[PDB]
Design a protein around this ligand. Structure first.
Ligand SMILES: COc1c(Cl)ccc(Cl)c1C(=O)O
Ligand SMILES: COc1c(Cl)ccc(Cl)c1C(=O)O
Ligand code: FES
Ligand code: FES
Ligand code: FES
Ligand SMILES: [Fe+3]
Ligand SMILES: [Fe+3]
Lengths: 340, 315, 334
């Protein structure tokens, strides 16, 4: 299974973690994730160095994670800080691997690769998630597809015209303007849908207003698989900076080669103290991101065996440029790492 | 997967198909099966050319199946007839594979193999199924075993096995016979229980009873549809039914003759063939072969011809 | 994948068997186990020689197991004794493999290997199990781990401190003392846990206590759990002799036969309760959880070339492990 290990991935949302460890597998690597008594999150390889028991089934003793099996204790650095057996000696072999963790932007980032290379400067900017001018809601979902399929999905936001048609269909779709801007290690796909009546969901954003709007659906990608979109609507022929908008957290982390973690969110500048608009956004997230898109990408994954065995290649359309560029960047990184 | 792909297989019963596509895999090939607005059945490879989404999760748009993902639209021939995107150009690369498909004898036949070789004249004769001299009912079942195990079971049970070109017939007459319970009341007798196999796995039996020494064609009888189609190497689809010339207007009789367990496979035999399939690993690893009994003649013949069709297909 | 096939394994408890066959796989070999009308247990390959049906889904007819599919009948030797078809001929090709079986000590022992080599003399001694001075109770558990992970567990019984916290905790356990004796194909870990107050379990039946365990190849263990007022001779204790016997099912799953044979309270049904309760919670639940968890981590450990780091409690389990691997590779030496 080929992953890009030397990169930061979101392993969890902060709300997911506590002093009770969470066992989760990223890049085929099982982790025990917990918040220590002092509040700082730790991430240990979920395999006790003694007999390979899951430490994530342990409990904290003295703020140290204790193996459930024979009770070796570890700090957040993976250092064995107590051995209860015999003379109680703790040689270097008893230490477990620890992973660099940065909690930032209401995300838990982890470096699954060479820890000497982990550079917090390199973590993607998701500042809107902690910016008090934005209201942020979201969650986690597990999907039985290769993460790359969900990168494809998200880098062609036009799929929403069909996959999400009940919420997202617009009658101005055939007037789409699409631009792609390639950075170094960053790619923006911009869409302007001009002059239409708002979609069901943009209508909700606007509290019903039925009259013609402009809508923008931009998405930004940073390596390996972390995306931030810009979903905006505004009376036709108004500035884009002045629009009500959602900045959408859409971050994938591989679990196995054929399964992945999906961390999604909306950070919105409108209806900031409105629980019902919270519910609208979490509704959308539940139906669109976690069912509708799940159904499509999970079915594509099930067809991978046929595609491969019959040497089938995709046929590309005008909507594909951003997703293909991103795909070729991920491949390029994969291949760099594969030596060695 | 070793299949005989160059043959007609039943993919569906016509009553399973509508303008809402059915997704079904035959011989490790996923199909989208639907009826166009003029009623004609289309069979497409269930994998969109763009990014491989399941067309069978799509709906029709003006008679054309629309991909649920980014909206490419296809005709029954697999031609892409609409591309919503950009200049809306439809190069040959956007066409999806379409499979030869014939609706005939109230069955949907598909040719999953080399399409140049697909000859609808070679489709097995199940004509009793649309003969109004017969009352026809049946249904569909799925089994987690290799299809050859159910062909075996089916070709089993004055005798007579007669053998030819992709057809084998197994005949049994039982004179001074015993009447079946269903045909009981519609009259000693002669019984008949015959079965005809055509390649690769399509069978039609003949369960019959008459007064002593009657034309077997004039008997009280049922012709039973028993057609298997491989799904994976270790699973199959089973299409079953009966075409009867008695109680043609009794619907209670329809009910039992529509029973999977009454007509196709009792829970207890299903348990056995699926259990045989779980034993396949062990037998293969230990080079264990089956030991045949006298009653195995027809099965073995049919087995040998299938194997012959397999061997021919390589290369 | 790699098993020691030339050895005796427990395939069932006697009370699991009857005229209704049981299908059970040992060392990747599916068996049909049943008790004939004369009381004698037979073990056949659970694959009809005709078309491979599960004979274990069949019934006895005149004491002969009848294939459910087309009704061949077999004796306990695997001879075909009836063919209801055509002229009823029974060619030798219709016989099924029958495995050597010995019912001893309230266990059913099967030899899955080279049948020429099956010496019932080499079956381990669990005589306490049919001793009138002992009351024996236990049962069967299935586990989704490689059996060797459960040998490990049983040979280092100083996890009960943490895995079994609730029943088997003692403050004495920093004052353990653990002696290991190795004989030919037999290893004993001894231990006397002196001076300490009793765990929940030992109170339920200033105390001294002792967990010894005997391993015999391949994976058959008998333990000794005793307890007695501080000062008392080990040999005059009240104690349980614990049957802990594993049989591989597949490379990543096994069969566990556990029991207690106790010399105390032996008419006493409450005591049956306590002992069956421990077995349910400790053995078939808590230990289950840990070893199945470790099995799931095998892929990563092997892919990454991780070897375990051993501790002071680990001698017995390590010596046993090394002997199993020895036998395993010896046999792969074709
Ligand atoms: C998938 O991206 C979105 C679209 Cl296309 C419309 C509205 C929203 Cl809230 C999102 C989102 O960020 O989840
Ligand atoms: C696992 O072995 C035991 C220990 Cl460590 C304590 C008490 C008992 Cl009853 C047993 C037993 O034989 O199950
Ligand atoms: S497995 Fe962790 S202490 Fe033994
Ligand atoms: S996958 Fe069918 S149109 Fe994109
Ligand atoms: S499979 Fe046992 S008699 Fe046919
Ligand atoms: Fe979507
Ligand atoms: Fe235990």
């Amino acid at each position: 299974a080929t992953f890009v290990r030397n990169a930061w991935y979101v392993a969890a949302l902060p709300e997911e973690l506590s002093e009770k460890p969470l066992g989760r597998t990223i890049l085929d690597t099982p982790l025990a994730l917990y918040r220590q008594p002092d509040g700082v999150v730790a991430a240990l390889l979920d395999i006790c160095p003694h007999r390979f028991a899951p430490l994530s089934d342990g409990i904290l003793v003295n703020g140290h994670l204790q193996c459930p099996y024979h009770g070796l204790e570890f700090d957040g650095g993976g250092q064995c800080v107590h051995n209860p057996h015999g003379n109680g000696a703790r040689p270097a072999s008893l230490n477990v691997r620890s992973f660099p963790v940065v909690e930032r932007d209401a995300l838990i980032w982890i470096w699954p690769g060479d820890p000497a290379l982990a550079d917090p400067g390199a973590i993607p900017d998701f500042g809107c998630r902690v910016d008090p001018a934005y209201r942020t809601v979201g969650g986690y979902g597990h999907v039985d597809c290769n993460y790359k399929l969900l990168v494809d999905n998200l880098m062609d936001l036009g799929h929403a015209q069909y996959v999400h048609r009940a919420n997202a269909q617009t009658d101005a779709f055939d007037r789409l303007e699409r631009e792609v801007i390639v950075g170094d290690g960053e790619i923006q796909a911009l869409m302007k849908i001009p002059g239409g009546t708002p979609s069901v969901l943009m209508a909700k954003f606007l509290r019903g207003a039925n009259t013609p709007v402009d809508a923008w659906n931009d998405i930004r990608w940073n390596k390996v698989s972390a995306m931030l979109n810009f979903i905006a609507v505004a009376p036709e022929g108004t500035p884009k900076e002045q629009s009500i908008h959602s900045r959408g957290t859409h971050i994938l982390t591989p679990e196995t080669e054929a399964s992945c973690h999906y961390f999604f969110g909306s950070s919105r500048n409108f209806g900031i103290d409105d629980p019902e608009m919270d519910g609208v956004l979490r509704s959308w997230q539940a139906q669109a991101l976690v069912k509708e898109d799940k159904v499509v990408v999970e079915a594509i994954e099930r067809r991978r065996a046929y595609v491969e065995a019959n040497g089938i290649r995709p046929a590309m359309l005008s909507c594909d440029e951003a997703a293909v560029r991103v795909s070729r960047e991920i491949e390029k990184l994969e291949q760099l790492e594969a030596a060695r």
